[PDB]
Amino acid sequence: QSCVWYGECGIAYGDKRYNCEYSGPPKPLPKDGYDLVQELCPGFFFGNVSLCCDVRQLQTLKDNLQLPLQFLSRCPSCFYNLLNLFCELTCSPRQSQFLNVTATEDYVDPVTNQTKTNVKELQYYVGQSFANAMYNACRDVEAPSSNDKALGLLCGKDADACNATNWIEYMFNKDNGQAPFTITPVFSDFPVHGMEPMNNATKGCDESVDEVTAPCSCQDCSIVCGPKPQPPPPPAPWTILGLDAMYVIMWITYMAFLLVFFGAFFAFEGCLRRLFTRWGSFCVRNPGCVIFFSLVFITACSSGLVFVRVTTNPVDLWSAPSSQARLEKEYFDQHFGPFFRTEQLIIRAPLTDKHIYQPYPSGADVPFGPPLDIQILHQVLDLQIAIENITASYDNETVTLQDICLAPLSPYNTNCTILSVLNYFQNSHSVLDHKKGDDFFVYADYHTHFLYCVRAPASLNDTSLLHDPCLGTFGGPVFPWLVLGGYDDQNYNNATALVITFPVNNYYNDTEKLQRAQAWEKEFINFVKNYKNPNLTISFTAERSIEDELNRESDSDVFTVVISYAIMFLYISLALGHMKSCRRLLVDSKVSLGIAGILIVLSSVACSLGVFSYIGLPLTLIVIEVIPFLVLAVGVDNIFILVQAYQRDERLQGETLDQQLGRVLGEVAPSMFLSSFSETVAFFLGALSVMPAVHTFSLFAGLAVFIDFAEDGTSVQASESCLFRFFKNSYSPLLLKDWMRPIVIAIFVGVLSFSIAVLNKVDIGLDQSLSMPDDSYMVDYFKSISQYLHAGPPVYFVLEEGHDYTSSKGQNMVCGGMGCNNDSLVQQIFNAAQLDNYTRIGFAPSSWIDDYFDWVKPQSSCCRVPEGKQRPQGGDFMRFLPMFLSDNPNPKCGKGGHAAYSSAVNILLGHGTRVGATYFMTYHTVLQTSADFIDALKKARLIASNVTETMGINGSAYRVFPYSVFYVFYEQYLTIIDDTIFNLGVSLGAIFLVTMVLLGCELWSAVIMCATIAMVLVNMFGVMWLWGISLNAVSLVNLVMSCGISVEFCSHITRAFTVSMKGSRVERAEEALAHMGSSVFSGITLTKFGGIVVLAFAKSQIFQIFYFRMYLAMVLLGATHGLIFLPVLLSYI
Ligand SMILES: *[C@@H]1O[C@H](CO)[C@@H](O[C@@H]2O[C@H](CO)[C@@H](O)[C@H](O)[C@H]2NC(C)=O)[C@H](O)[C@H]1NC(C)=O
Ligand SMILES: CC(C)CCC[C@@H](C)[C@H]1CC[C@H]2[C@@H]3CC=C4C[C@@H](O)CC[C@]4(C)[C@H]3CC[C@]12C
């Protein structure tokens, strides 16, 4: 083994040295060079480390690595072979085999005058295969942020002219101003005149350099690339449903035809109860006090229980508690509580054009969208600074953004967190205004930094001539997707919108601090609303917009329903007693039910919004049945009055009917104890139902009687009219309603198929105020970013190997997410992840850093490591040490010094084994619809299952958690399918069982009433999934009420028809329905007559425009079916 040089001699040019000629054997490297050799040329680091280089040469090699690193650092395999080319030249103990000195000159030591010899030039015999592999591993590497190949910057020519041998030739030519002296390469896989070319093994860009150094990426490599995604599923059925409906229709038609052809070819208990009731009445018919006294008692119980009208309604608790939805939210809290909320603005520049700007030294045309005009950025910065300076007052105190913001690096840094493109310029007008240029070029400006910072937002030093940091003033990177909108692919320069985001404390556990934050928010909303700049359109996130709009909009419409309620109760008042006899009752009846309900609920605590539309419209049941019992008696007139004339007309039609009506109602509201977020309003009303029932018992009858004994004339006429109507109805049924009845069946059939073959969750569409609209419009337009978090809490974490396995799970999750997409982009996640396992690794790779104590004090630097061999081991496993260091950070360590810390961990003392709870979050955009977010949530749950299902263990111990400002809120829209089927199902049983608690005709009554259950439902669904309909936490309650009123109708028509004393074919039926038809047109008609004022009327928002919309449609359909349904059933019988 022999050298050609050893050590450094004279200056060549600049700061550059020739090496000293030396032709002896290699020399063991001093221990003081072991770090350098381990770092640069670890292949030589064994035995006596006998090399043809000294420590000075290795230091010089390290110092010269800056420019290759500048362009190749991202692809370690590419850089590795290059380093080996230089290591072999500099240090190989067999230099003489592949190097031949070709020029020299004297070196004279200035002090001793001893002569040595500069190696001025030499020839280097490089393997052909080595050179080609070195080029091959680097040829796809892309410059840090640039569609140009890194080799175009290291080859003295463009990448399309760069080849393996001319690249090496260029690097080795002193003319390049970097190489200290020229090395002339000769490329051969064969010996050349006894020289044995350097042909060291090489690594491709698809290979790992070592155990702690991964292969190169796709973006910077070719070998390790592909394949894209191919898991797209395409479903689409439905026609089947249509065919079935059609088939059914055909069958029906056939049946009808057949029928036509044929015609051409040819109880005790109940009674007893009634009797008892009558007896009671007769007794009661001997005193008014008792009754009223009872009403008075109810006046108290109702009002009494209403003590402390604390009937809350806020804030966002309707998904109900318990289960996973709530339990999951609570869990994430104990670990961190409320991650926090964001006030967010989207900003566009409608009066500004795009523009071009060549960035040195490429000079390629890069277009920049309207909002990235330099002047609009200055204007957006002024907006931003003004927002930071907003103050609100609460009590006598002042509230700033600095009091409520996420300031991640407090106290050492109170700097608030503002996600904005202006934070790439540290929110500084001057810094952004800067621009290093001369008479010839602009070398660096607000463009270069931008194009660099979108690729390296954590950088504390632009690689351009500006040398400005990218890191935001809050101490963390601002990711480009989260601050720009309306750009294509990752061409952030083409953005048509800026997004500005301020995280502020939600203060879920602190009431006094939350109120202060909400005071600030109100000022923020005001500031934005009144901000004047023709150059910018600014639009909303906040908090009140969604909470203030609902409480600010939902009011005017009140006057609508209110009015309608009055005009309706007026008619129902005129109807029967007309005068001041019936009015009193009702007013008391409606009050009793409403008052009683509030009292029944006060004994358990509860409250709600829709709980009002139900309470009011629900009261109808009490009025309807109550409005027909009195009317029927009015139509009475025999040998008796008051005495038996009241018990024979009351305990005869009111006993059974009412008795059955009250039950069918209590069964729908009573059994409302189910599982969901509506049982409260439900039960409360159902309870108010028996109450309202027992009320109108002796109260209405007695009162109506006690007092019942121009106005008279009017009553008679109405009665007469009713009678006439009944007669007409009878006549109609007499003819033949078989054809139309079949047609009706068709309508129901078509409805079931059209209603069962549509569906939907529920979106958010509030009135057109302003704020809310802005946020809704901005969201629709924007895209790519704006977020929620998927999040896991994990336990244990102590077995180096289980951490490696958990990291593989984590990396795999990042992949699927960055893949799963839809239409023209991903849907699932976003997405990507920054747990921490990578931070530790980074630390291991590198080194220390300075911490500067606040306000003053000497600098503190402290740390260490642990390479080379150990380095790989340390990073591989163990974790207490790393963990306790990694949690305490706030100043990088290398070429700069910034902040790169976080949170989520919280062990005790130095028990690193007890660490919790690491949390990884990938924010994904959506804002599509109630069904869109629900679909994404559905995917995330399966993602959580897949990760937890992959590698589990013992029983239970934490799992996946998808907490996104949309869950708990949409969590309900999840089990909506089971709810509807379960909710209605529970009523179908309570109704079929109740209607039998005083009958049990097997198929007679059972089917009669049972048919009404599916009869009306198909209508409600049709209108909902058919025309102007909807569905949600309310619609579900809507369907419930529908089945309720429906039961009411049927109940009366049927309890008196089924029996039928003097029985017949279809004659007795027409007789019963007659006395029941008059009431069907009274309450029903009126009720509709009221909705119209509510439905046919107007409003200032679609909100109720639907709620009270279907009501009238669904309520109307049910009423119509009442008469038809009964008639059809009778005929069938
Ligand atoms: C160039 O290749 C040679 C031959 O593989 C490397 O020398 C070997 O290095 C390993 C790793 O330390 C030792 O185990 C062998 O004993 C060495 N063999 C010989 C013949 O010396 C050398 O490390 C490579 N050069 C560089 C810079 O990595
Ligand atoms: C202009 C760009 C492409 C140059 C990129 C390659 C540079 C970094 C290369 C070209 C020639 C190389 C030098 C070749 C010879 C020596 C002598 C050695 O005893 C110390 C290292 C040193 C000084 C090398 C450092 C790296 C070097 C300067």
Ligand SMILES: *[C@@H]1O[C@H](CO)[C@@H](O)[C@H](O)[C@H]1NC(C)=O
């Ligand atoms: C080195 O190669 C050159 C030709 O390039 C030759 O003239 C010289 O004699 C050789 N010296 C040695 C030691 O091989």
Ligand SMILES: *[C@@H]1O[C@H](CO)[C@@H](O)[C@H](O)[C@H]1NC(C)=O
């Ligand atoms: C879940 O992972 C399993 C393998 O464990 C895989 O077969 C399936 O395609 C994955 N599904 C989703 C939705 O990620």
